[PDB]
Amino acid sequence: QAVVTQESALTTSPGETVTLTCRSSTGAVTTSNYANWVQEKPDHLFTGLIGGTNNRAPGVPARFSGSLIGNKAALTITGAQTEDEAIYFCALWYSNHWVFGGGTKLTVLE
Amino acid sequence: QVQLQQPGAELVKPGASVKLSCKASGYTFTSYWMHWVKQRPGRGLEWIGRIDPNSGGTKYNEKFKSKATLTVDKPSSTAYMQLSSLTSEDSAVYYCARYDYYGSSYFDYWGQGTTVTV
Numbered sequence: 001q002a003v004v005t006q007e008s009a010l011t012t013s014p015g016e017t018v019t020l021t022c023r024s025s026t027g028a029v030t031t032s033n034y035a036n037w038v039q040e041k042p043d044h045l046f047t048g049l050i051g052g053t054n055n056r057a058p059g060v061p062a063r064f065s066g067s068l069i070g071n072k073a074a075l076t077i078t079g080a081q082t083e084d085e086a087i088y089f090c091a092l093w094y095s096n097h098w099v100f101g102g103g104t105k106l107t108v109l110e
Numbered sequence: 111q112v113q114l115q116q117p118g119a120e121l122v123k124p125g126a127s128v129k130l131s132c133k134a135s136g137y138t139f140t141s142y143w144m145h146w147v148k149q150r151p152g153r154g155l156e157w158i159g160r161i162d163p164n165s166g167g168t169k170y171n172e173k174f175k176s177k178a179t180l181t182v183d184k185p186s187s188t189a190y191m192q193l194s195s196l197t198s199e200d201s202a203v204y205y206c207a208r209y210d211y212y213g214s215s216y217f218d219y220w221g222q223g224t225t226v227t228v
């Protein structure tokens with residue numbers, strides 16, 4: 001039923017800062033939707049980065065952080081390094097199911 | 111060093127069921143949830159469903175109901191997912207991933223995925 005929308009692609013440059021967002025067809029996204037950011041690296045590799053809106057996965061470089069910016073879930077990258085080129089997914093828990101966003105290609109160094 | 115092991119592929123002719131497995135190691139199995147996810151370009155991530163090791167109890171994406179069958183093997187620390195009649199949509203990656211029902215609410219560890227090419 002619900003649809004989760006993310007930016008299709010963001011282009012950034014090294015040493016700069018970038019923010020990715022996650023939107024719901026329901027209403028605002030809050031701490032209750034359980035916003036999780038998943039990182040996909042080239043050739044089908046995944047690793048959770050954030051979970052619980054602002055809880056970083058262990059090991060993940062400090063330059064990454066989640067939060068909520070208004071009615072949307074968000075991922076912030078500070079001093080984006082080339083090692084951040086990847087597809088960022090977000091997911092939301094709506095009542096009886098998880099819905100994944102379309103995914104955001106993050107072209108580090110554009 | 112947490113790890114979720116999934117066989118690489120499956121190559122089958124249409125309308126042919128397949129059982130998929132996912133092995134866990136380096137942590138305490140029954141203490142976390144198991145979710146199966148599907149990938150295939152276009153965005154691609156669709157949640158198939160979850161399974162609670164303890165319970166044997168599941169929550170499935172209503173889309174995949176008359177399709178997928180979730181089960182586990184407690185002793186081998188292995189999660190399963192059967193697919194009935196591979197009509198042929200199914201040519202996709204099937205992932206197993208770790209989820210903290212009792213926790214920090216993240217999909218931290220992921221399996222390499224089992225590709226299914228019909």
Ligand SMILES: O=C([O-])CCCCCNC(=O)Cc1ccc(O)c([N+](=O)[O-])c1
Pocket residue numbers: 034093143160169209211213215
């Ligand atoms: O809610 C709190 O008080 C804090 C930590 C709890 C985080 C909430 N997470 C959930 O329980 C979501 C939730 C519910 C039912 C369910 O079957 C699943 N699942 O299959 O993954 C997730």
